[PDB]
Design a protein around this ligand. Structure first.
Ligand SMILES: *[C@@H]1O[C@H](CO)[C@@H](O[C@@H]2O[C@H](CO)[C@@H](O)[C@H](O)[C@H]2NC(C)=O)[C@H](O)[C@H]1NC(C)=O
Ligand SMILES: CC(=O)N[C@@H]1[C@@H](O)[C@H](O)[C@@H](CO)O[C@H]1O
Ligand SMILES: CC(=O)N[C@@H]1[C@@H](O)[C@H](O)[C@@H](CO)O[C@H]1O
Ligand SMILES: *[C@@H]1O[C@H](CO)[C@@H](O)[C@H](O)[C@H]1NC(C)=O
Ligand SMILES: *[C@@H]1O[C@H](CO)[C@@H](O)[C@H](O)[C@H]1NC(C)=O
Ligand SMILES: *[C@@H]1O[C@H](CO)[C@@H](O)[C@H](O)[C@H]1NC(C)=O
Ligand SMILES: *[C@@H]1O[C@H](CO)[C@@H](O)[C@H](O)[C@H]1NC(C)=O
Ligand SMILES: *[C@@H]1O[C@H](CO)[C@@H](O)[C@H](O)[C@H]1NC(C)=O
Ligand SMILES: *[C@@H]1O[C@H](CO)[C@@H](O)[C@H](O)[C@H]1NC(C)=O
Ligand SMILES: *[C@@H]1O[C@H](CO)[C@@H](O)[C@H](O)[C@H]1NC(C)=O
Lengths: 175, 21, 759
């Protein structure tokens, strides 16, 4: 299917010394039998758990091709590059963890168009830029740990950040 | 392939089918 | 024949940075006067340079503008070299130029405007370069053009609508570019047009109806575009059409019956589109068809027996459609057939006997259909069959012999009614990388011949009734990545030879009769991701050597005889998303640093049904992002740690059937907003009911039954929408029981016996 193709694209953009993605065969009808990939009863991909796989590489735009993706865990890898704006195209996405990575660039404003988002952790990265105001729009946000990557431009209190204890910023060169 | 001989028959693919498990 | 040409050629030689084959060396050694004898250089009768032709000479560098100083030049052929840079803008000066072929190089920048001014140019091949920009309207005014290759460049913008002016055109190929907008209708006015390839672009809108006017058209390739609407019936009037490729588009509506009029057709591929209704019988009138596929569409109805007429047919893809009714028994009429895919349809009936007739058959995919009946024994006679997917069907009978002589690679026959044993001759085919019989009635042992197919990557025997031990031959597989034998009657000890699979990323042995000490050697597998040993006869303590597998996303020891206390060594694995130790004999406390060393565990923690004794470790708070925690049916003693207020991803929490006591902390449940089901039932819990229960929006079932809880029932629960099942029952509660809410349809049982409750 298309989702299997998307994840195949992700796999091609990544170096995998631990052979974690060995399980991923693009020729399968769905990527639901792939390890570190979990789907729902309708075969649409729900979770992707790549955390601590010691991968290396860049993310991919096709990560927006998983409409039902809820939990995306790439955390604690050597992955570099930016965060694709197409991550906004995910309708219901509960947890986005890119933390503990070498990822650089700005945090895309599209990260504020997922209104189902609870956990966003971008912390311990190379991320540089300004915080999207739409992150104050999403309101669910039980946890935002983003820190350790120099950003500044301000610290918004615009009101979904009203609930944050501020380890949530912690050397953003912030304000 | 030269431009003269034109587009051949195998220049396009067949639709590949998935694997069920 | 004088100096100026010589200087042009020399100035071309210079500017070529690398010549490993030493071609141009010829030019140096022969001399300047004899230059008409130079390699690649040919002159006319009068002695003027006409053709410069250098192909696959591996030349690097740039094309010097000095070529413009060869005036009598007709053909310049640079095909298949390393030339970089931009095509010299002075190239318009040649004027005698017949064919400019830059094919297969690195040329970049916009196409020189000068080219379009040439009145003598027929053959223009720019294919396979870096050229950017757009095809200018000016191209319509250069009227000598016949063959234009644009294939595989960076060209953008829209195809000039005036292209019909390019009267002499026989071929136009823009494929593999960024072109957008629609297809110019004027194109349909080129009467000498043979080949047209627009494939691999962003082109939109409908296919021009007037395309039906091209009677010399042989290849029409629109594939991998955004094209919409329906296939025009007018296309039925192109009689010279050998090849029609519409695939990977937005095309809709029914297939034109008039397509049946193109009898020169060999390849018809409309697949990956929105097409609807049923296949017109007229399509079976194309008897020269080799490749045909309708796959990845909305097509309905049956597949007529008339496919038997095609007979030149090689590849057939009908898969991923709505096709219904009986299977095409006459499929055996096409003996050139190699690939046949009907998968993902509602097609029913039985495979034909004499299916063995095909012989050439490589791919057979019937998967996900209504097909019943036995696999035809005649399939023994398909000797060229690499792939057989019959999986997910109603098929019956026993797996025949003959798979040993087929030379297969992938076999998925699973999810069927198949009975009998696994034919041993099936192991005589060594090229098999995938064997899946899973979910059938197959009975027998798994014989040591299994050791015969070394190349296997994945093996699924699950959901059958099979018995006997697991052969040590299993060790030979080597590269197996998935091994699933679960849900069978396998008995005995796990063979230590399984340690010899170092590539195995998952193991499911669950729901079997397996027993005995787990071989030490089996812990030498570092690559094993998921391990399910659950529901077996395994006994004795949980080996500390389980720590030796440090990458585990999934571990289930559940439903066994396991002895003693949870080994602390298990702290070694922090990658666990699912730890199910539940339903065993396990005694003693939960080790704190094990519960801590699992920091991020995303799914399932189940210790339930064990002899475990103690306070619930505060390190359970360190567990975050965990959806389910079941500690139920244990000896756990003390009060609930407030420390676990830190896990907000908890959906279901079951502490029921335990010795837990003290007040239920409100502080701990503030954090657990997300909870859907909560079971505190059958404990010593005292004090009031937490008011934060009213702050739980996702709470569905709440069981407080069988406790010491002293408080008045909190109304908060009343108006709560998502609450469905509530259990109060045996307890001491006072006063008015809430009216509007789940209390409307409530059963008296849930409130009884509560002693005094006004109502
Ligand atoms: C017929 O089966 C073969 C395998 O036996 C399929 O081949 C693979 O297809 C994928 C994707 O196109 C390629 O990456 C592999 O290299 C192919 N393997 C071989 C050996 O060709 C093929 O897709 C099947 N044919 C159809 C039309 O479904
Ligand atoms: C390899 C090849 O093309 N040989 C074909 C054969 O498959 C058939 C027959 C007509 O059906 O014509 C032969 O030339
Ligand atoms: C689908 C399947 O293969 N399972 C069948 C089951 O339905 C049936 O009840 C049993 C007895 O006939 O045999 C087995
Ligand atoms: C072509 O030849 C002339 C001399 O006749 C020379 O001046 C010119 O530089 C050459 N090509 C160009 C236009 O550079
Ligand atoms: C079309 O093709 C034939 C070539 O045999 C030719 O006689 C005829 O003039 C052509 N028409 C053109 C050039 O438009
Ligand atoms: C070509 O086919 C069309 C139907 O698509 C038909 O009406 C027409 O008469 C045929 N040729 C012409 C232009 O006469
Ligand atoms: C087959 O029919 C069933 C019941 O009508 C339907 O649910 C299913 O979508 C159909 N399958 C296919 C592949 O069209
Ligand atoms: C294979 O073909 C031969 C004749 O070509 C036939 O006798 C045999 O029955 C076929 N298949 C089987 C079942 O061996
Ligand atoms: C369980 O553990 C005890 C003590 O280690 C051991 O002696 C016994 O054999 C085990 N139980 C059984 C019946 O396997
Ligand atoms: C809660 O758990 C107990 C077992 O201790 C079970 O019997 C009961 O049915 C559960 N309550 C509900 C309503 O789920």
């Amino acid at each position: 299917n298309a989702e299997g193709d998307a994840l195949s694209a992700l796999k091609n953009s990544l170096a995998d010394p631990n052979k974690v993605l060995q399980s991923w065969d693009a020729t399968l009808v769905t990527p639901c039998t792939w390890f570190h990939v979990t789907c729902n009863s309708d075969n649409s991909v729900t979770r992707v758990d790549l955390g601590n796989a010691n991968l290396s590489g860049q993310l991919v735009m096709q990560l927006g091709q998983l409409p039902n993706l809820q939990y995306l865990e790439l955390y604690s890898n050597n992955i570099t590059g930016t965060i694709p704006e197409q991550l906004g195209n995910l309708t219901e996405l509960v947890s986005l963890d890119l933390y503990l990575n070498n990822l650089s660039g700005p945090i895309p404003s599209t990260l504020g168009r997922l209104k189902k988002l609870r956990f966003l952790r971008l912390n311990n990265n190379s991320l540089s830029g300004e915080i999207p105001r739409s992150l104050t729009a999403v309101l669910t946000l039980q946890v935002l740990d983003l820190s350790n990557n120099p950003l500044t431009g301000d610290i918004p209190v615009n009101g979904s950040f009203s609930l944050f204890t501020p380890i949530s910023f912690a050397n953003t060169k912030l304000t | 392939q030269r431009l003269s001989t034109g587009s051949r028959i195998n220049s396009a693919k067949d639709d590949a089918a998935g694997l069920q498990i | 024949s004088f100096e100026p040409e010589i200087e042009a050629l020399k100035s071309f030689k210079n500017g070529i940075s690398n010549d490993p084959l030493g071609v141009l060396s010829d030019w140096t050694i022969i001399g300047s006067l004899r230059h008409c004898n130079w390699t690649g250089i040919t002159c006319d009768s009068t002695g003027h340079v006409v053709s410069v032709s250098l192909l696959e000479k591996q030349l690097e560098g740039v094309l010097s503008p000095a070529i413009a100083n060869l005036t009598y030049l007709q053909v310049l052929d640079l095909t298949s070299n390393s030339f970089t840079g931009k095509i010299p803008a002075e190239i318009g000066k040649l004027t005698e130029l017949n064919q400019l072929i830059l094919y297969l190089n690195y040329f970049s920048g916009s196409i020189p405007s000068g080219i379009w001014e040439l009145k003598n140019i027929f053959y223009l091949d720019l294919r396979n370069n870096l050229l950017s920009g757009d095809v200018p309207e000016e191209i319509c005014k250069t009227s000598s053009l016949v063959l234009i290759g644009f294939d595989y460049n960076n060209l953008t913008g829209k195809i000039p609508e005036c292209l019909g002016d390019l009267v002499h055109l026989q071929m136009f190929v823009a494929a593999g570019n960024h072109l957008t907008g629609s297809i110019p209708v004027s194109i349909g006015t080129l009467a000498n047009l043979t080949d047209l390839d627009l494939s691999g672009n962003q082109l939109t809108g409908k296919i021009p109806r007037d395309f039906g006017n091209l009677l010399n058209l042989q290849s029409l390739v629109l594939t991998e575009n955004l094209l919409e609407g329906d296939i025009p019936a007018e296309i039925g009037n192109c009689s010279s059409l050998v090849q029609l490729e519409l695939y990977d588009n937005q095309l809709t509506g029914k297939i034109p019956a008039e397509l049946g009029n193109l009898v020169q057709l060999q390849a018809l591929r409309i697949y990956k589109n929105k097409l609807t209704s049923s296949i017109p019988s007229s399509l079976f009138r194309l008897t020269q068809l080799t490749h045909l596929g309708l796959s990845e569409n909305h097509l309905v109805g049956p597949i007529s027996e008339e496919i038997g007429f095609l007979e030149s047919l090689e590849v057939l893809t009908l898969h991923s459609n709505n096709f219904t009714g009986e299977f095409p028994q006459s499929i055996t009429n096409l003996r050139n057939l190699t690939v046949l895919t009907v998968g993902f349809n509602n097609i029913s009936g039985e495979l034909p006997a004499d299916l063995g007739l095909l012989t050439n058959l490589r791919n057979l995919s019937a998967h996900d259909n209504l097909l019943t009946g036995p696999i035809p024994s005649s399939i023994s006679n398909c000797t060229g069959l690499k792939l057989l997917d019959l999986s997910h069907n109603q098929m019956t009978g026993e797996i025949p012999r003959g798979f040993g002589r087929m030379n297969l690679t992938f076999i998925s026959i699973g999810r069927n009614h198949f009975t009998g044993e696994i034919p041993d001759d099936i192991f005589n085919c060594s090229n098999l990388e995938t064997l899946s019989v899973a979910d059938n009635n197959l009975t027998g042992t798994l014989k040591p011949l299994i050791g015969k197919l070394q190349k296997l990557r994945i093996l699924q025997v699950s959901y059958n009734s099979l018995t006997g031990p697991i052969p040590r031959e299993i060790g030979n597989l080597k590269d197996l990545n998935i091994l699933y034998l679960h849900s069978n009657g396998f008995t005995g000890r796990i063979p230590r030879e399984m340690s010899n699979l170092t590539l195995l990323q998952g193991l499911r042995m669950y729901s079997n009769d397996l027993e005995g000490p787990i071989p030490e050697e089996m812990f030498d597998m570092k690559l094993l991701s998921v391990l399910d040993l659950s529901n077996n006869k395994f006994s004795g303590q949980i080996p500390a050597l389980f720590s030796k597998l440090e990458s585990l996303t999934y571990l289930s020891l559940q439903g066994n005889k396991f002895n003693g206390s949870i080994p602390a060594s298990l702290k070694s694995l922090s990658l666990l998303n699912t730890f199910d130790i539940s339903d065993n004999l396990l005694t003693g406390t939960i080790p704190g640093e094990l519960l801590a060393s699992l920091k991020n565990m995303q799914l399932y923690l189940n210790f339930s049904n064990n002899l475990l004794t103690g306070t619930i470790p505060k390190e359970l708070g360190k567990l975050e992002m965990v959806q389910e925690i079941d500690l139920s049916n244990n000896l756990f003693s003390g009060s609930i740690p407030r420390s676990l207020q830190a896990c907000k991803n908890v959906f279901t929490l079951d502490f029921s059937q335990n010795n837990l006591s003290g007040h239920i902390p409100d502080e701990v449940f503030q954090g657990m907003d997300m909870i859907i089901s909560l079971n505190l039932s059958r404990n010593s819990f005292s004090g009031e009911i937490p008011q934060s229960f009213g702050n739980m929006t996702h709470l569905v079932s709440l069981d407080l039954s069988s406790n010491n809880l002293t408080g008045e029932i909190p109304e908060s629960l009343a108006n709560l929408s998502t609450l469905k099942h509530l259990k109060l029952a045996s307890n001491n509660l006072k006063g008015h029981v809430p009216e509007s809410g789940v209390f409307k349809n409530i059963n008296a049982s849930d409130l009884m016996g509560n002693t005094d409750l006004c109502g």
